[PDB]
Amino acid sequence: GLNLIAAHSHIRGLGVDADTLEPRPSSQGLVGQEKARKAAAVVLEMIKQGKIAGRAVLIAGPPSTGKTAIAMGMAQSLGQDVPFTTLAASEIFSLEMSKTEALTQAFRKSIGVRIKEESEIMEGEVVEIQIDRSKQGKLTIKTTDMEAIYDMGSKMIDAMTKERVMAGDIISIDKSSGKITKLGRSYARSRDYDAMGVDTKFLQCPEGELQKRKEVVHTVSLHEIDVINSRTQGFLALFSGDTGEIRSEIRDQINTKVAEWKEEGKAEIVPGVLFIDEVHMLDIECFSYINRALESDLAPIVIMASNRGVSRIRGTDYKSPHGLPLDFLDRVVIINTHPYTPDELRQILSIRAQEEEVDLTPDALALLTKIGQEAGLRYASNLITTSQLIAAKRRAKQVGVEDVQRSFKLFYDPARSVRFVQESEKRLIGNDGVVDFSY
Amino acid sequence: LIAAHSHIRGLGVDADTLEPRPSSQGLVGQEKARKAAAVVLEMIKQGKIAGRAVLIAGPPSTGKTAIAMGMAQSLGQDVPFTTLAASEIFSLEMSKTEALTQAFRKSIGVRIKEESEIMEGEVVEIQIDRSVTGGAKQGKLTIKTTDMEAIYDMGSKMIDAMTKERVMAGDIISIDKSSGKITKLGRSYARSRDYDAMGVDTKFLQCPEGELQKRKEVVHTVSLHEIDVINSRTQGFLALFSGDTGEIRSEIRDQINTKVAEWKEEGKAEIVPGVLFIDEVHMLDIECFSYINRALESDLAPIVIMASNRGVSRIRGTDYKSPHGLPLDFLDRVVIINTHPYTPDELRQILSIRAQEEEVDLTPDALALLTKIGQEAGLRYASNLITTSQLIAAKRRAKQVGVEDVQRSFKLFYDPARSVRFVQESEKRLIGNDGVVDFSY
Amino acid sequence: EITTEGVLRDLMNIARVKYRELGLCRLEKAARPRASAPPIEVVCDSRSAVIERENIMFHPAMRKALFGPTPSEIKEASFGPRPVTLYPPRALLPAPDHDKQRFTNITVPSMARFVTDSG
Amino acid sequence: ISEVRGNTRDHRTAAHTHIKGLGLNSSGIAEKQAAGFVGQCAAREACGVVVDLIKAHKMAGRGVLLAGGPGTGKTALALAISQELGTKIPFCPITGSEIYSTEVKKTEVLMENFRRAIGLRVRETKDVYEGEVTEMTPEEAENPLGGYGKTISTLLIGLKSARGQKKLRLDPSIYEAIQKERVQVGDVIYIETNTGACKRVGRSDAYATEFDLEAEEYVPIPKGEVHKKKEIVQDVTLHDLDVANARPQGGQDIISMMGQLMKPKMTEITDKLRMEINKVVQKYINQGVAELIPGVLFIDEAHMLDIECFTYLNKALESPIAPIVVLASNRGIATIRGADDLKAAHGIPPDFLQRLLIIPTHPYEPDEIRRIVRIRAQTEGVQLTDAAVDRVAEHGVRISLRYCLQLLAPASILARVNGRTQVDVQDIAEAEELFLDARRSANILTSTGESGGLHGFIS
Amino acid sequence: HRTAAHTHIKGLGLNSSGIAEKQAAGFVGQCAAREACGVVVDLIKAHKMAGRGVLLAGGPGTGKTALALAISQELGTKIPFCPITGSEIYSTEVKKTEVLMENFRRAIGLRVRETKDVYEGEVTEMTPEEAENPLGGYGKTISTLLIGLKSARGQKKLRLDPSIYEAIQKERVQVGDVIYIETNTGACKRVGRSDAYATEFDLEAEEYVPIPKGEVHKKKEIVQDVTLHDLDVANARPQGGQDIISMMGQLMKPKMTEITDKLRMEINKVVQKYINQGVAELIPGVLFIDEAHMLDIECFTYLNKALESPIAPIVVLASNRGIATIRGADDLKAAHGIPPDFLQRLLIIPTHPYEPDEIRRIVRIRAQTEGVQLTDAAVDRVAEHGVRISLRYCLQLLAPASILARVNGRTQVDVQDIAEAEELFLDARRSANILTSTGESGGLHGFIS
Ligand SMILES: Nc1ncnc2c1ncn2[C@@H]1O[C@H](COP(=O)(O)OP(=O)(O)O)[C@@H](O)[C@H]1O
Ligand SMILES: Nc1ncnc2c1ncn2[C@@H]1O[C@H](COP(=O)(O)OP(=O)(O)O)[C@@H](O)[C@H]1O
Ligand SMILES: Nc1ncnc2c1ncn2[C@@H]1O[C@H](COP(=O)(O)OP(=O)(O)O)[C@@H](O)[C@H]1O
Ligand SMILES: Nc1ncnc2c1ncn2[C@@H]1O[C@H](COP(=O)(O)OP(=O)(O)O)[C@@H](O)[C@H]1O
CATH of the domain at E213: 2.40.50.360
In this structure, the strands spanning B108-130 and B269-273 are antiparallel
Q: Which of E12, E11, E45, E53 is nearest to E312 (CA)?
A: E53
Cα separations in angstroms, E60 against A88, B319, D91, E357: 55, 20, 53, 19
Integer Cα distance of A301 and A271 in angstroms: 8
Domain residues for the domain of E188 are 113-223
Centre of ligand 2 to C-alpha B79, Å, is: 23
Centre of ligand 1 to C-alpha C116, Å, is: 88
Q: Is the distance from CB of A216 to CB of A199 less than 8 angstroms?
A: no
Three-state secondary structure call for residue B421: helix
Under DSSP, the state recorded for E63 is S
As for chain E, the residues directly before each break of C–N over 2.5 Å are none
Segment D248-252 long-range contacts (CB within 8 Å, at least 24 positions apart): D248/B238, D248/C12, D248/C15, D248/C16, D251/C94, D252/C90, D252/C92
In this structure, the strands spanning A30-31 and B334-338 are unpaired
CA within 13 Å, CB half, A304: 29
Three-state secondary structure call for residue A373: helix
In this structure, the strands spanning E217-227 and E177-182 are unpaired
In this structure, the strands spanning D37-38 and D33-34 are antiparallel
Measured in degrees and rounded to the nearest 5, phi and psi for residue E387 equal: -75, -50
Q: Which of A417, A323, A321 is nearest to A376 (CA)?
A: A417
Q: Is the distance from CB of D213 to CB of A156 less than 8 angstroms?
A: yes
For chain C, say whether D260 makes contact (Cβ under 8 Å). Answer: no
Integer Cα distance of D239 and D218 in angstroms: 37
Integer Cα distance of B301 and B108 in angstroms: 8
Q: Is E25 left (phi over 0), alpha (psi -120 to 50) or beta?
A: left
Task: Residue A90: count other Cβ atoms within 10 Å of its Cβ.
Answer: 10
CATH number for the segment(s) A342-421: 1.10.8.60
Q: Which residues of E170-202 are buried (b: 16+ CB within 10 A; e: fewer)?
A: bbebeeebbbbbbeebbbbbbbbbbeeeeeeeb
Three-state secondary structure call for residue D373: helix
Q: Choose from A318, A319, A329 for mutation: most chain B CBs within 10 A.
A: A318
Q: Is the distance from CB of C91 to CB of C103 less than 8 angstroms?
A: no
Distance of CA E344 to the CA centre of its chain: 29
Integer Cα distance of D33 and D374 in angstroms: 12
Integer Cα distance of A169 and A128 in angstroms: 10
For chain B, say whether A313 makes contact (Cβ under 8 Å). Answer: yes
Let me know how long chain C is.
119
Task: Residue E106: count other Cβ atoms within 10 Å of its Cβ.
Answer: 24
Cα separations in angstroms, E422 against B49, B54, B335, D95: 19, 14, 10, 49
B380 lines ligand 2 (CB under 6 A): yes
Within 8 A by CB and 6+ apart from B419, the residues are D65, D67, D345, D346, D353, D358, D360
In this structure, the strands spanning D324-329 and E187-194 are unpaired
Q: Is A76 left (phi over 0), alpha (psi -120 to 50) or beta?
A: alpha
Describe the crossing of helices E415-424 and E398-407 by its angle, rounded to 10 degrees.
120
Integer Cα distance of E42 and E45 in angstroms: 5
Task: Residue E141: count other Cβ atoms within 10 Å of its Cβ.
Answer: 17
Centre of ligand 4 to C-alpha B304, Å, is: 20
Q: Which of B99, B30, B95 is nearest to B62 (CA)?
A: B30
Distance of CA D316 to the CA centre of its chain: 22
| 3-state SS track over C89-111 | CCCCCCCCCCCCCCCCCCCCCCH
Integer Cα distance of A86 and A94 in angstroms: 16
Q: What is the resolution of this structure in A?
A: 2.7
Q: Which of E79, E68, E74, E81 is nearest to E16 (CA)?
A: E74
Three-state secondary structure call for residue D431: helix
Cα separations in angstroms, A26 against A22, A33, A357, E5: 12, 10, 19, 86
Measured in degrees and rounded to the nearest 5, phi and psi for residue A96 equal: -65, -25
Q: Is the distance from CB of B17 to CB of E407 less than 8 angstroms?
A: yes
Q: Do E407 and B16 lie within an 8 Å CB cutoff?
A: yes
Integer Cα distance of E330 and E296 in angstroms: 10
Burial class of residue B425 (count of CB atoms within 10 Å of its CB; 0-12, 13-18, 19+)? exposed
Integer Cα distance of D395 and D429 in angstroms: 11
Q: Using CB atoms, which residue from B166, B194, B432 is nearest to D332?
A: B432
Q: Is the distance from CB of E129 to CB of E136 less than 8 angstroms?
A: no
**Identity at E202, one-letter amino acid code:** D
Q: Is the distance from CB of D19 to CB of D76 less than 8 angstroms?
A: yes
Q: Which of C104, B408, D84, B396 is nearest to E247 (CA)?
A: C104
A94 labeled part of a ligand binding site: no
Q: Which residues of D97-106 are buried (b: 16+ CB within 10 A; e: fewer)?
A: bbbbbbbbbb
Integer Cα distance of E147 and E127 in angstroms: 6
Centre of ligand 1 to C-alpha A9, Å, is: 11
Task: Residue E322: count other Cβ atoms within 10 Å of its Cβ.
Answer: 12
Describe the crossing of helices D307-318 and D106-116 by its angle, rounded to 10 degrees.
40
- Residue bearing the CA closest to ligand 2, atom 23: B65
Closest approach of D316 to chain B, Cα-based (Å): 9
Task: Residue E422: count other Cβ atoms within 10 Å of its Cβ.
Answer: 20
Distance of CA A77 to the CA centre of its chain: 14
Q: Would you report the helix, strand and coil content of chain A in percent, each value rounded to 5? A: 40, 25, 35
Within 8 A by CB and 6+ apart from B254, the residues are none
Three-state secondary structure call for residue D112: helix
**Identity at B301, one-letter amino acid code:** A
CATH number, residue D430 = 1.10.8.60
Task: Residue E310: count other Cβ atoms within 10 Å of its Cβ.
Answer: 7
Task: Residue D389: count other Cβ atoms within 10 Å of its Cβ.
Answer: 18
Residue A39 host element (H or E):
helix A34-49
Measured in degrees and rounded to the nearest 5, phi and psi for residue B439 equal: -90, -15
Three-state secondary structure call for residue E433: helix
Q: Which of D399, D454, D402 is nearest to A307 (CA)?
A: D454
For chain C, say whether D217 makes contact (Cβ under 8 Å). Answer: no
Q: Which of D408, D404, D402, D407 is nearest to D378 (CA)?
A: D408
**Identity at B252, one-letter amino acid code:** I
Integer Cα distance of A218 and A221 in angstroms: 10
Three-state secondary structure call for residue A218: strand
Method: cryo-EM
Residue D340 host element (H or E):
strand D339-345
Q: Is the distance from CB of E190 to CB of C104 less than 8 angstroms?
A: no
Pocket test for ligand 4, best of E8, E391, E393, E397 (most atoms within 8 A of CB): E391
Measured in degrees and rounded to the nearest 5, phi and psi for residue A73 equal: -60, -40
Burial class of residue A310 (count of CB atoms within 10 Å of its CB; 0-12, 13-18, 19+)? middle
Describe the crossing of helices C60-67 and E162-170 by its angle, rounded to 10 degrees.
30
Distance of CA D235 to the CA centre of its chain: 13
For chain C, say whether E233 makes contact (Cβ under 8 Å). Answer: yes
Integer Cα distance of D209 and E103 in angstroms: 73
Q: Do D351 and E448 lie within an 8 Å CB cutoff?
A: yes
Integer Cα distance of D351 and B61 in angstroms: 9
CA angle centred on D286, ends D281 and D287, rounded to 5°: 95
Segment D341-345 long-range contacts (CB within 8 Å, at least 24 positions apart): D341/B314, D342/D307, D342/E449, D343/B433, D345/B416, D345/B419, D345/B420, D345/B423
N- to C-terminal Cα separation, chain E: 42
CATH architecture of B344-423: Orthogonal Bundle (1.10)
Closest approach of E251 to chain D, Cα-based (Å): 8
Q: Which of D296, D299, D300 is nearest to D324 (CA)?
A: D296
CA dihedral E213, E214, E217, E221 (to 10 degrees): -90
Integer Cα distance of A264 and A115 in angstroms: 12
CA within 13 Å, CB half, D267: 22
Let me know how long chain E is.
449
Within 8 A by CB and 6+ apart from C40, the residues are E235, E238
Tell me, yes or no, whether chains C and B touch by having 3 or more C-beta pairs under 8 A.
Answer: yes
Within 8 A by CB and 6+ apart from A233, the residues are D261
Three-state secondary structure call for residue D383: strand
Radius of gyration of the CA atoms of chain D, in A: 31
CA angle centred on D70, ends D65 and D73, rounded to 5°: 65
Alpha-helix residue ranges (DSSP H) falling in C7-110: 7-11, 14-21, 47-57, 60-67, 71-79
For chain A, say whether D264 makes contact (Cβ under 8 Å). Answer: yes
Integer Cα distance of D284 and C9 in angstroms: 12
Within 8 A by CB and 6+ apart from E234, the residues are C33, C35, C36, C37, E240
**Identity at A375, one-letter amino acid code:** A
Alpha-helix residue ranges (DSSP H) falling in D247-306: 254-261, 271-287
Under DSSP, the state recorded for B140 is E
Within 8 A by CB and 6+ apart from E415, the residues are E375, E377, E378, E381
Cα separations in angstroms, B26 against B5, B427, D78, D79: 9, 42, 35, 38
Integer Cα distance of D172 and D139 in angstroms: 9
Residues with CB under 6 A from ligand 3: D 15-16, 19, 36-40, 68, 70-76, 372, 375, 401-402
Burial class of residue A164 (count of CB atoms within 10 Å of its CB; 0-12, 13-18, 19+)? exposed
**B171, β-bridge pairs:** B187
In this structure, the strands spanning E314-319 and E323-325 are unpaired
Integer Cα distance of B41 and D306 in angstroms: 35
In this structure, the strands spanning B53-57 and B303-308 are parallel
Distance of CA E325 to the CA centre of its chain: 30
Q: Do B226 and C94 lie within an 8 Å CB cutoff?
A: no
Cα separations in angstroms, E40 against B3, E17, E44, E47: 58, 14, 6, 11
Q: Is the distance from CB of B292 to CB of B330 less than 8 angstroms?
A: yes
Radius of gyration of the CA atoms of chain A, in A: 29
Dihedral of CA A203/A206/A212/A214: which sign? negative
Closest approach of E227 to chain C, Cα-based (Å): 8
* DSSP state string for B92-111: SSS-HHHHHHHHHHHTEEEE
Under DSSP, the state recorded for B342 is P
Q: Is the distance from CB of B311 to CB of E415 less than 8 angstroms?
A: no
Q: Is the distance from CB of E335 to CB of E346 less than 8 angstroms?
A: no
D63 labeled part of a ligand binding site: no
Integer Cα distance of E353 and E29 in angstroms: 10
Integer Cα distance of B137 and C47 in angstroms: 44
